[PDB]
Design a protein around this ligand. Structure first.
Ligand SMILES: CCCCCCCCCCCCCCCC(=O)O
Length: 288
């Protein structure tokens, strides 16, 4: 038995872990109305993408990995000699990448494809990849791995702050007067992941109080977990994410694993400039 673990680009794992464990990546894409297409990888400049998103009158569209990259990746893993492939995808409720990976897993002969719906995104999704790899190293069975990941999904979440009301207007989700009143009142919508769906939670004035609410809610949730791993997922606003990270380091005991990360173009295209998330998992994920 030879078990491998792969994922998509929305897991936003650092290139270090991808090189160390040789994790395969099915990249997503983001295309603008001008024809400019960005394929998610650790080589493109996120600053250029943010500058484009600012210099674009219309919001871009996002694209799941085409029903092809999964096929070649499974084929290469089978040619290398792998009996089982555990695939970790972003939330199937927000994207079709999980469905495309599952469908591609049916057209590849010679290896079992275990597609997993992480119901999350970013490093919170990459935590499933890290746990799967760790438990392959421990000598677990793919069914036991899927069971463990499903149990982990029960104690895993992500809260989010949207800062770009102009981006929400550019997508048509809000009106002009709404955006103006939100800017005047410093209104910052707070959202959360629930069963793979992004649902509203609070509407907090100013980004500072919204960050405090993020911390309060996540700490209240993880107080009951035997193991806690927190993740700051920042955007182009370095100061906000760094402040939240340092506040967590000061407020949380060392028994908590606090980490920092940043999301890429596919997430930024829908979150806008200044978005910031706090995610949690109820396990001690091996981040090295
Ligand atoms: C850590 C930040 C989380 C914010 C995530 C916001 C993105 C919502 C949906 C993701 C992109 C849409 C679907 C991906 C590509 C596609 O299938 O079209």
């Amino acid at each position: 038995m030879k078990i491998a673990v792969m994922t998509d680009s929305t897991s936003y794992l650092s290139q270090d872990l991808i090189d160390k464990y040789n994790i395969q990546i099915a990249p997503l894409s983001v295309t603008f109305d001008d024809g400019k297409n960005f394929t998610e990888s650790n080589e493109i400049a996120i600053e250029e993408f943010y500058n484009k998103m600012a210099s674009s009158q219309t919001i871009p569209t996002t694209s799941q990995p085409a029903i092809g990259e999964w096929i070649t990746k499974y084929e290469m893993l089978r040619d290398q000699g792998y009996t089982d492939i555990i695939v970790i995808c972003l939330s199937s409720g927000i994207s079709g990448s999980y469905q495309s990976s599952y469908q591609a897993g049916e057209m590849v002969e010679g290896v079992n494809v275990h597609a997993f719906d992480s119901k999350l995104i970013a490093m919170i999704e990459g935590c499933y990849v890290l746990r799967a790899i760790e438990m392959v190293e421990e000598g677990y069975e793919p069914q036991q791995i899927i069971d463990d990941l499903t149990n982990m999904r029960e104690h895993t979440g992500l809260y989010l702050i949207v800062d770009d009301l102009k981006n929400l207007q550019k997508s048509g989700r809000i009106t002009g007067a709404q955006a103006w009143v939100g800017t005047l009142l410093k209104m910052k919508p707070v959202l959360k992941f629930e069963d793979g769906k992004i649902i509203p939670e609070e509407k907090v004035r100013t980004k500072k109080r919204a960050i405090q609410t993020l911390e309060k809610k996540v700490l209240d949730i993880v107080k009951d977990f035997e193991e806690v791993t927190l993740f700051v997922i920042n955007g182009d606003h370095f100061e906000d994410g760094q402040a939240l990270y340092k506040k967590l380091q000061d407020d949380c005991p060392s028994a908590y694993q606090v980490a920092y990360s940043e999301f890429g173009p596919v997430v930024a295209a829908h979150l806008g400039s200044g978005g910031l998330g706090l995610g949690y998992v109820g396990r001690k994920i091996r981040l090295t």
